[PDB]
């Protein structure tokens, strides 16, 4: 219920939030700024007027951080931040669930549902890691890329509105063994961006399977 | 044998617990930052408290032969199992025959409290409390049920 | 069929009831002048609510043969009384000999809902009168 | 605990009620303008009284432990329901076990009069009397059963 | 499903247990500082192990409906408690009315393994909460 952020670490400072709650605040639930690192292993940060957690050129380390109903990006890293959350459970974010903004985010087995926009997104450089991430009920896209790479060795994107996975202006989506389920074209490529995946499940593709084009190359093999 | 028990209670449960275990004056904060203030054992000031708000309260449950126990299970020396609600251990007609008595924790989990004719000490009770329900998976469910109330 | 029952609940019971049967915005008062306010289903304000304070609340229950009843009482033709929990009126195995059914209202009060094979609203409760038409007779006057 | 009870009675019922509850001298008017005059508890003068004429009379029924109650229902602490006709509440052999007692009103409608070991006060009784039979629909039937008797 | 139980065994019981559940090389300690050493499943060294010395040993038991259980206790819906020896959970003739099954752990302790038709790990133990979405309402401020 604070006017500004819930817990903030700034200018090379450490804070530990092992199971604490940062709810209802008028700004970002947890924010690291300029090299500071907070640790939120099992925190609960839901309902805030802004991002559930933000990394303004600082590190955030989580294990099963809970987010819900935040006013904007549930997890966000920018200007060199790094948000690590092996089992983050984000949901019901008004904007993007988790967005990497020129920085790296590591959600290996996150389960994220009912986003108001893209399930995950890596815009303006940066990378996002994923191993068995579960998307459900996304707003626009299950996965998105803007000159940025997203790795998902397996996934379960479902209930997405427009397109399961989208790649633009470069950037890979190494979604190999994904169990995607959607009516629209599954794998999408635009403006010279690559996608790599398996051929075990026949999924609709925007471009011919394994040939170059003006749009990027796909390897359905 | 006094056992701390930390729990999270909604507003109704918190009010009930506070009035049963008399609190003269105290402020209870919630999960989502809302608070309720008791003054002279009467509710005075409550912030914006939504449903499903959780308040943390620790209550001491003491296990003694003379005081009543809400729910326990008794095994006779012959082999009969019986259950007793809200009576003290000494209130049994023939405590001579009783061999073992297990407390019941509303999870259908039994914790041994009485064996070999004597109460179980505090540390063995802690061991049994850890030991009774090891593989207890609780349903994971999270709803914020709130947003910064003011216009900012 | 709508049954209205007035009850008296302490603060904890009042809060549980109000959150269970959603109330958006309204103020409940008590005997000693203490009050509580719900606004958008949130407890905004409370004013010196001591214990043993009784808030009077009216409650509407829809009664229907298909809908289950929390706690009702049935009386047969012979005279045997029984009580049932969480069972719809149509669910009873022996409705052939069931003459009356009341609803036990947690205050130990009794409200009739079923009378002689019909819901109480459908029953008509005939009065008594000797059968005869208009007299239409001219009588002598004493004046 | 005295309860007013207003009712409409035919000539036979009115005469019976008057003679049971002794009336020294009084004139009772009817629905249709006919009247009956009691003098010295004996019927003296009756106007032209047709069948189905209704007389309004108010009688006081007082509910007390010591005086008999015509029809009540008793619930034991064990869970047994019994009905008693025309005996006082104190006349029960073991009033100790009795938990609740409801008056019966010939409409198969129960009104709580005895709970928690004490009688129900007058105002709670009025509340329960309103509350017991809310959705009681009475058959609507109107017959004039009369005409201005004289030749005019 | 893996159940871990800590027990206290004298030297003879400890030796029997260790040789029964093969241990290659490890040292067991006791309360009074006495210790015993197994090396390649042989008792190489013992150090002043008096009687009534309790060695604390943790034991892992795999619990599965097919695998038989040494000693368990079952509770029906009505309330009857019974005990069974050397019988798999699936083997019980009346699993229809069996509500709970605990494992009697030779210390007279009780560990829940079966709850309402499922193993305890499969059961999810739903909590309680009133159903409602986010408030998302702007409230006046008192400042």
Q: How many residues does chain E have?
A: 143
Nearest neighbour of C135 by CB, restricted to D100, D107, D146:
D146
State how far the alpha carbon of A92 is from the alpha carbons of A46, A159, A172, B151, C33, in Å.
9, 14, 27, 21, 42
Structure tokens at C96: 């052939």
> In C, residues 80-99, which contact D (CB 8 Å cutoff)?
81, 83, 99
Structure token pair of residue A220: 């359905």
Residue E7 contacts B where some CB pair is shorter than 8 Å: no
Which strand (E) or helix (H) includes residue A165?
strand A163-168
Tell me the technique behind this structure. cryo-EM
Identity of the residue in D108, D112, D144 whose CB atom sits nearest the CB atom of C109: D112
Cβ of residue B48 closer than 8 Å to a chain C Cβ: yes
Given C19, C39, C44, which is nearest E130 (Cβ)? C19
List all residues of chain A from 63 to 92 with a beta carbon under 8 Å from chain B: 66, 68-71, 89, 91-92
Give the three-class secondary structure for A115: coil
Cβ(A87)–Cβ(A63) under 8 Å? yes
Could you tell me which residues come within 8 angstroms of residue C81 by beta carbon, excluding any fewer than 6 positions away? Answer: C73, C74, C75, D73, D81
10 Å Cβ neighbour count for A217? 17
D10 touches C: beta carbon within 8 Å: yes
Residue of E nearest to B48 (CA): E139
Sign of CA dihedral C39, C41, C47, C53: positive
**Which runs of E-coded beta strand occur in chain B?**
2-9, 25-29, 35-39, 42-46, 55-62, 68-76, 81-88, 98-104, 110-115, 118-119
3-state secondary structure of D129: helix
> How does DSSP classify residue E93?
S
Closest alpha carbon to A129 in A170, A163, A175, A94: A175
- Count of CB atoms situated within 10 Å of the CB of A131: 15
Identify the chains in contact with E, defined as 3+ C-beta pairs within 8 A: B, C
Smallest Cβ distance to C124: which of D79, D127, D137?
A: D137
> Which DSSP letter does residue E50 get?
-
Taking a C-beta distance cutoff of 8 angstroms, is the pair E36, E43 a contact? yes
- Three-state SS at B106: coil
Q: Please, which residues have CB within 8 angstroms of residue A209's CB and are 6 or more apart in sequence?
A: A218, A219, A220
CB-nearest partner of A1 from B33, B140, B145 = B33
Going A138 to A142 to A148 to A149, the CA torsion angle's sign is: positive
Interface membership of C12 toward B (CB under 8 Å): yes
DSSP letters for A116-127? SS-SEEEESS-E
Q: How far is CA D115 from CA B11, C74, C107, D109, in A?
A: 31, 20, 9, 17
Chain E: give the shortest CA distance to residue C19, in Å: 7
Bridge partners of residue E45, in order along the sequence: E37
* Mutation for testing the E interface, residue in B134, B146, B147, B152 having most E CBs under 10 Å: B134
Interface test with C, best of D55, D99, D131, D138 (most C CBs within 10 A): D131
Q: Flag if A23 and B143 touch (Cβ within 8 Å).
A: no
Q: Does B34 touch chain A (CB under 8 A)?
A: yes
Are the CB atoms for A135 and A112 separated by under 8 Å? yes
CA distance D85 to D69: 7
- For residues A89-103, b (16+ Cβ closer than 10 Å) or e, as one string? bbbbbbbbbbbbbbb
Beta bridge partners of B6: B58
D135 DSSP assignment: S
Residue partners of B109: CB distance under 8 A and separation at least 6: B132, B133, B136, E110, E112
Element (H, E) at A188: strand A187-190
Query: Measured between alpha carbons, how far is E5 from B127 in angstroms, rounded to an integer?
Result: 10
All residues of chain E having their beta carbon less than 8 Å from the beta carbon of residue C22 are 132
Q: Which chains touch D (3 or more CB pairs under 8 A)?
A: C
**CB E130 within 8 Å of CB B130:** no
d(CA A94, CA A47): 10
Question: What is the sign, positive or negative, of the torsion defined by CA atoms of B44, B45, B51, B52?
Answer: negative
Cα–Cα distance, C16 to B11 (Å, whole number): 9
Query: Could you tell me the two tokens for A139?
Result: 């707003």
* DSSP state letter for E47: E
Q: Is D12 helix (H, G, I), strand (E, B) or coil?
A: helix
Rounded to 10°, the helix B11-20/C11-20 angle is: 170
Q: List Cβ neighbours of D91 (8 Å cut-off, separation of 6 or more).
A: D68
Give the CA angle between residues C75, D97, D99 to the nearest 5°. 55
The CA distance from C23 to C60, in Å, is 13
Q: How far apart are CA B149 and CA D152, in angstroms?
A: 82
Report resolution in angstroms. 3.6
Residues of E in contact with B146 (CB under 8 A): 134-135
Which of B51, B55, B144 is most worth mutating to test chain C (most C CB atoms within 10 A of its CB)?
A: B51
The alpha-carbon radius of gyration of chain C (Å, integer) is: 24
Express the helix, strand and coil content of chain E in percent, nearest 5 each.
Answer: 10, 45, 45
The first and second tokens of residue A86, run together, are 């092996």
Helix (H) or strand (E) run with residue A145 in it: strand A141-146
Tokens of E106: 């030779």
- The values of phi and psi at residue C98, to 5°, are -75, 120
Contact criterion met (CB below 8 Å) for A30 and A55 = no
DSSP H or E stretch at residue C47: strand C43-47
């Amino acid at each position: 219920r604070n006017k500004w952020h819930g817990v903030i670490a700034s200018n090379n400072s450490k804070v530990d939030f092992t199971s604490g709650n940062a709810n209802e605040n008028g700004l970002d639930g947890i924010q690291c700024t300029h090299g500071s690192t907070v640790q939120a292993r099992l925190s609960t940060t839901n309902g805030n007027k802004r991002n559930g957690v933000l990394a303004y050129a600082g590190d955030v380390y989580c294990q099963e951080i809970n987010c819900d109903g935040n006013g904007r990006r549930g997890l966000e890293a920018t200007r060199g931040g790094y948000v690590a959350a092996y089992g983050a459970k984000v949901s019901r974010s008004k904007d993007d669930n988790v967005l990497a903004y020129g920085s790296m985010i590591s959600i290996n087995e996150a389960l994220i549902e009912r986003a108001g926009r893209n399930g995950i997104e890596a815009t303006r450089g940066g990378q996002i890691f994923a191993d068995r991430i579960t998307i459900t009920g996304s707003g626009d896209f299950g996965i998105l890329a803007y000159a940025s790479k997203v790795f998902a060795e397996a996934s379960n994107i479902s209930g997405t509105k427009n397109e399961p996975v989208y790649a633009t202006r470069g950037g890979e989506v190494t979604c190999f063994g994904s169990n995607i389920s959607s009516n629209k074209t599954v794998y999408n490529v635009y403006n010279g961006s690559r996608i790599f995946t398996d051929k075990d499940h026949g999924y609709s593709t925007n471009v011919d399977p394994q040939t170059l084009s003006s749009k990027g190359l796909i390897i359905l093999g | 044998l006094i056992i701390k028990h930390q729990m999270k209670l909604h507003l109704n449960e918190l009010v009930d617990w506070a009035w049963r275990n008399g609190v003269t004056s105290e402020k209870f904060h919630s999960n989502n930052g809302s608070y309720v203030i008791f003054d002279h054992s009467a509710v005075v000031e409550t912030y914006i408290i939504n449903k499903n708000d959780l308040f943390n309260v620790t209550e001491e449950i003491e296990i003694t032969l003379d005081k009543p126990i809400d729910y326990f299970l008794e095994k006779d020396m012959y082999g009969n199992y019986r259950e007793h609600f809200g009576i003290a251990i000494n209130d049994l007609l023939f405590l001579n025959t009783t061999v073992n008595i297990w407390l019941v924790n509303d999870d259908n989990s039994h914790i041994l409290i009485y064996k070999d004719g004597k109460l179980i000490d505090e540390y063995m009770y802690h061991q049994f409390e850890y030991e009774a329900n090891q593989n207890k998976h609780i349903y994971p469910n999270n709803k914020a049920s709130g947003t910064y109330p003011h216009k900012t």
